[PDB]
DNA sequence: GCATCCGTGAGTCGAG
DNA sequence: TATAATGGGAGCTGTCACGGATGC
């Protein structure tokens, strides 16, 4: 679904998706605070949905801070089929995508789906952030020309 | 992509293949068969 | 000798790559007879083995780079000045 | 069933 | 875009070298509990929580900023590995 | 409200029963209502007639059959997971030749599934539709030789798996060659075997260009039919001894055997018409008076040489022509499999006749039903043409039944399918729809039967045409095959008529598909209606003439995906076909005769007719469809109401007062909104969720079995080890969740405890056990729990148990428990909406009502569509629908605008004018003049050349409203949108692709057995696939460690993934990954292939990746 | 159903008297633009300020005429006069006529205007005109108190036959830009964050400007009192 | 910015260009009658005529837009490059144009209707051939494209 | 050590016998009752390993 | 030298 | 643990686009 509000480097990530994706980190940061005595307690606490509480969301927000995920839309035709975005927790089950990268994925809003991957180590996260960040690739490795550029509504208004 | 010198270690082959392949679905069936022929 | 992309692919040195591409029986038998070794020069090979590919952050060129702060650098410098 | 998603 | 990314791409002969530098530095910071940081207290990256501002938990952010401050030395064959390990352990226990 | 209809076209005949293809095909096949002596030879009757009599000596013969009554009714079959079917009994008589002993008995042949009223089947509890198949009609064809331009290829094709194709070709050397079973041999030889002599072929074929001399061979006529036969047998059968009777038997089996080689009745007729001859049997030759006699080959060779010579009255054939392509319906397919099974039964019967007691044998002791049962069952369960029913809405089922597939057994294989097959042939007109098909791989291979189209007894598709004699159009209708259609000049249906007479001097018509302008003196026939050109889905798109064919396709397809809504409405602009579709799908309940309604209940409707009889109609309520949509009927009448014959009683699913309801009529504004509708995304008003527009009920089935084990029995129980009362709160005494309890992910639907596998406690477990002093229980908790992302209210529980009346399960299973969970889904971001014109999008934003663009009178709009979606796609139908929709919004009336005959611009403008009066004159009467904002907007529109300068504000507002545009205020500002905006009612549907179903994520989960990699699918809580192309992506980015993570740490490196997880939860960075298990598997597989895979170092000295475990 | 709401925290960020940023968070859904738009309208349109309405220059017949001895044409001087920021220290004073006389090789700035009682020139270094040898400039400018923006052709005021009406920019506010960003308090992610940005000429500070704006609005809410 | 049905503007010039065309058609027809032109010659001439006519009415639509209605939504979206190209817009306000037989041969009788005026059943069915062929093209070429990409990757990957 | 190379070659019958932990002399898989591997069968624990 | 035969290829994720 | 019994059946059909091997 298109977020208009997203900065070029950002993507809307559903809360539950992020919770499950980042789950070990969330357990760790839950033990770091007083939310749970230990890891296992935290996991058993997250297992049921009616056991979920306010503090855990702020905890998750602390967890994902500075981190990025990878968005990929099949088919991946060229390098930009995967791009790195800083996740922003959103209400709803839909992933929010930034308009300018659409042309790069050949994505539109008619019901296309995308996949999220979480790079784990410091190395992978560094690679993602420096090399694969959407805002960092502005030009076609193919033609050299601009890749993320105004289209549709934007060009219209301007 | 960066409009500057290529960084050593950049994998060129995959980039070339992808760059040639991506527009391929915009060519019909002298078009795509000519490309494959070449 | 000019050969098309497929034959050129199958004709490469790395038998892992050729075997992953196509004509698996042919490639593999011709590799087994001659007792071929795969030096793992290309990407596909190391991908199959699950190693760090020889490109980007996995290129020998930039991968051995070290980083150190001036404090620790000078401490180690004094350790070197002692001996 | 395929293309951009009629069915 | 990562803050001052252009300068970082300027610092190195290859972008991937920058990547390796930042990753390694970040691992150092994680392992030594941030004690080894070259950043003054006022330069510390901040995460804004419910209570107030706190230290940014993200190691990579730190490493990139440290790198921007020019207070780091990066290159091949600076010091033998076990020596660097033992020394960093000496100055900053873990 | 008043429904105003447009159009001047008068339909002579209505649409035929839409399911007639299915129902009439199957009925024709079974003849269950026909008394045995009156049965025509067709279908299973014909199968019996072919198989019997059986010889070799004893003789088993066929008399008649009978089909009994179903052991269980349809609903009961659906619930008990049975098959709705009737017993098949067969009267046979065993006859000993010598003894003269005759024994007559009725043997039980197993069961034949019955077709339900709506034209579907129930197989093993599931609703299945048998999809009719399109193929190449049997007969004789002549097609141009691709290599040799001057020459041709003759082909003789029988029914599928009814025996081999035959190719007659004139070779470069001059001899005429025949190809059978991929064997080329001179046709002369076969001609000699048939008993032809050189004289006969000389006088018959002599008139030609001396191609006949290529058929002239002296060595062939130098041998009698016997010698020629043995010669041919030696030619076709290398290594097989050339015995006389064996040769006669083989060649007879290949050519003259009706039991083996069979042309269709279609092939019969077609061969007759093409070759200009008359066939006795359905074979190519006969065995008569000890020898062979030729029916076919000589006429065929004659026509071939006559085509080669250039003789007038001889032509090639179009295999894409619908005169040359036919349809095998349900009955023909089922009968085919029945014939196969019967053949197997005959083989078994003979085998049983050879040995065994030769005195005492009965038809019961000879006949085993097993092959026939296994055959029919194979067809209904595993055939590609037997398909899980599409139940999404009634239109889905109806369309599914009308599907024409080129795939399946004997049919085409895609990736083998060319462009010519997928093309729309000129003869598709009135027969197969040019529009409705898939976008993807199957395009042109799967199609839809046209609305007025019919399938004849021969299996060819026919379309109706009105007779025209001397410029007078009669009411006499004639259905034609494409071949017969080619013979006439057929005028278009929109051509002017005064009374029954053609009112135009120049009339548009067709000759062999080619458009031609003729005089009324020349017109033989005229189109029944434009409706006949398209399918049922396509016929539901109003203003279709304004839509590009591709978007028409998209909308057409998309209607099938419409989800039944609790509030669902009929479209404001209909095609007039909305009612028939509901009526034929048997979704809605109707009145059988005239009468009075005695009772009205939510569960039932009781009706007294003129017959004085009380007929009670029960209502299906909240049943789960195959696609999970809730199919329920609701009563539309009241106590005492008088009802004539055919009046509506209960409203089916996706139906409003008898009209087809696929969605809601919402008030739309077409303007860009803050990038929220960017790239086909859609913005909706929260007022839609408030009043429950686009809200749908969905039901999901959960099933669990408790069985007997060698470790002890599983049991459904409320007693679950290590669980609190908090977790057992909603569980009843037996352990089954109660009806009406709300269940969320993690909840227990059904409790179950399984005896633990034999377990050696790890030392830590033993020590901890000593510390807490608690016995380790013998049973563990296997209880069926609500999957992630699922949940709802529990509306039903079914419990079956072994040792209970009427209940027997599969061996080893003690009990089966089912829980039905229904959830009520509102609309939410990520759900897919679409119109009928091919505009499709996902709701990207739900704004509060105050943010929504509104009319001057304070009325907000439900949906904001993006204008950018219109021009590129070229579907203008939605625009007109919107305009007329605006009119209908203010006049409070709906419309019917049939395709190609419908409301045109001027009439829409009149309606919009009246609407303007209602929308404005009221306001003037209310004592409110023109707003300042309306002045600004009017200045703008005046600059845009939209309105004529100098007019009063009211006049210009009317001018805009007539163009379908109104003044709109932005809800956030209060300022007007600088231009006037197009606003109006549009019919939009909620498609079955819903974000609630599709969203999934996983950290860690189950892994595969051999590969040790994460499972696929959301149901399995598996991971996303990172494929070759994603790997290429990462490589091009040159992210090495990310890629290495994907290849190792995240999947299939055991030690690595365990270590990584432990590290992350500990707060430690992830460890260096190791060798992925799938490579170890590769190595071992290669070793199993007798190849040695050695991982070395740079020293060429072996490195052991198995860590010694594999080496002695 | 049962609702809790905390009073938002007003955040101020100011650079000199020329600019400021204003952040109000958290706000209830939709209330970002509910307060935002009105204040924008009120700020630009209704905030009290001073402008140059009319100007007379000796030996100058009309607006597009050229002045011998001066490089800028009359039009360019009128423009420079539009950017003059004049502050009235006395609330009683509705109008002033500022006289300026100069000649010779000198570049006239806003300082050269002869001082008037309770009239402060905020931008004395502002450029008006440059004169060469033999060039003369004799002018009188009419400064009135007013609100918003009034074009010359709208007021059409003249003290003299040769006096030229000038488009009067009264608004001390040069620009208002506001944006509402989604921010979260605890569980709810949609809660509104209002960020407001205001430009001024220095005569009235942005904080003063916004306070005046909310006062005008609040007073209007009292107009619903007595029928 | 919006789209009403009146926003597709059928130029007057169209009618003229049609009548003239008809006239020329007749001329060519006469040329066939007396045997000056062969069948294929006449066919080619008619095709050329209709091609040039189509071009002409496209230019007529766009000139009408440029001069008379510069802010007309179709024209705006086209010119800005936000949506649409001259041919599509021409189909909207102009004539639909020449149509292909399933064989690839072109019909002599072009659709004279815009999507605004609306097509006639025979016209629609005539066009469906083209639509189907195009759609099948799109569906079939994805596979071969993919195959090519894979071959290229495998040959260049080291 | 680090793996820098991968070699493939024809395996000698002696090498094949060297890999093998035993010969499978029986077609049997597991027992129809105990559901445990048979002796000298494809699943035998004697050869391939402990379950 | 040039017709002819046999084997091997023929897009991606999703659900199934 | 003993009349004598002595050569099997099903094929399965609208793809090219070929590559190198094999054949007058
Ligand atoms: C048993 O057949 C299976 C495949 C056999 O293999 C193959 C090789 O032969 C066929 C035949 C003979 C067909 O006609 C197919 C067909 O018409 C398809 C798609 C296919 O792939 C078809 C296949 C094959 O792939 N397109 C449609 O039908 C479209 C135009 C409308 C209906 C869509 C709904 C969603 C379905 O109807 C669905 C409810 C379900 O019924 C099918 C998905 C069914 O799956 C099952 C469980 O029944 C398929 C067809
Ligand atoms: Mg899409």
Numbering used by the authors:
A (entry chain D): 632 to 789
B (entry chain D): 1210 to 1238, 1254 to 1262
C (entry chain D): 1420 to 1502
D (entry chain I): 1 to 7
E (entry chain E): 2 to 95
F (entry chain C): 1 to 56, 63 to 1118
G (entry chain B): 2 to 228
H (entry chain D): 947 to 1104
Publication text:
GE23077 (GE) is a cyclic-peptide antibiotic produced by the soil bacterium Actinomadura sp. DSMZ 13491. GE inhibits both Gram-negative and Gram-positive bacterial RNA polymerase (RNAP) in vitro, but does not inhibit human RNAP I, II, or III in vitro. GE inhibits RNAP by binding to a site—the ‘GE target’—that overlaps the RNAP active-center ‘i’ and ‘i+1’ sites and that includes coordinating ligands of the RNAP active-center catalytic Mg2+ ion, Mg2+(I). Binding of GE sterically precludes binding of initiating NTPs to the i site, i+1 site, and Mg2+(I), and thereby blocks transcription initiation.
As a next step to assess interactions between GE and rifamycins, we sought to determine crystal structures of RPo bound simultaneously to GE and a rifamycin. In a second effort, noting that steric clash may be limited to the dmaDap sidechain of GE and the C3 atom and sidechain of Rif, we soaked crystals of RPo with GE and rifamycin SV (RifSV), a Rif analog that lacks the C3 sidechain and that retains high RNAP-inhibitory and antibacterial potency. In this case, the resulting electron density maps showed unambiguous electron density for GE in the GE target and for RifSV in the Rif target. Occupancy levels for both GE and RifSV were 1, indicating that GE and RifSV were bound simultaneously to RNAP in the crystal. The inability to obtain a structure with simultaneously bound ligands upon crystal soaking with GE and Rif, but ability to obtain a structure with simultaneously bound ligands upon crystal soaking with GE and RifSV, highlights the contribution of the rifamycin C3 region to steric clash between GE and rifamycins. The conformation of the GE dmaDap residue differs in RPo-GE and RPo-GE-RifSV. The GE dmaDap sidechain in RPo-GE-RifSV is rotated by ∼110°, in a direction that increases the distance between the dmaDap sidechain carbonyl carbon and the RifSV C3 atom from 3.7 Å to 8.6 Å and thereby alleviates steric clash. This observation highlights the contribution of the GE dmaDap residue to steric clash between GE and rifamycins. The crystal structure of RPo-GE-RifSV immediately suggests the possibility of constructing a bipartite compound comprising GE, linked through its dmaDap residue, to a rifamycin, linked through its C3 or O4 atom. Accordingly, synthesis of such a bipartite compound not only is possible, but also is tractable. Such a bipartite compound is expected to be able to bind simultaneously to the GE target (through the GE moiety) and the Rif target (through the rifamycin moiety).
